[PDB]
């Protein structure tokens, strides 16, 4: 729906999005990361700090 969340906060938004193109790398740093494709659900979440 165009909402961009950074570190959990909705800092900005755009028009609804059908497709997102991207090309991201850490390069020589040798760092790893993940991309997750998710859906909304109700859950009980315990938060600390």
């Amino acid at each position: 729906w165009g909402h961009f969340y950074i570190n959990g906060y909705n800092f900005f938004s755009t028009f609804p999005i059908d497709c997102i193109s991207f090309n991201l790398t850490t390069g020589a740093s040798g760092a790893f990361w993940t991309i997750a494709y998710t859906s909304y659900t109700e859950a009980l979440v315990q938060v600390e700090n």
Binding site: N7, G8, Y9, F11, N49
Partner: protein
């Protein structure tokens, strides 16, 4: 504008939240969020 007066009593408007208080820099770390409030709704 973003004029912030520290270590003194000020009339603030922070990301839409207004009130009177003393704002100080802390050495704490919180990774998530932009602002934090109390159970009463206060900043």
């Amino acid at each position: 504008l973003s004029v912030l007066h520290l270590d003194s009593c000020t009339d603030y408007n922070i990301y839409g939240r207004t009130g009177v208080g003393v704002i100080r820099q802390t050495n704490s770390t919180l990774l998530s969020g932009l602002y934090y409030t109390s159970l009463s709704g206060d900043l």
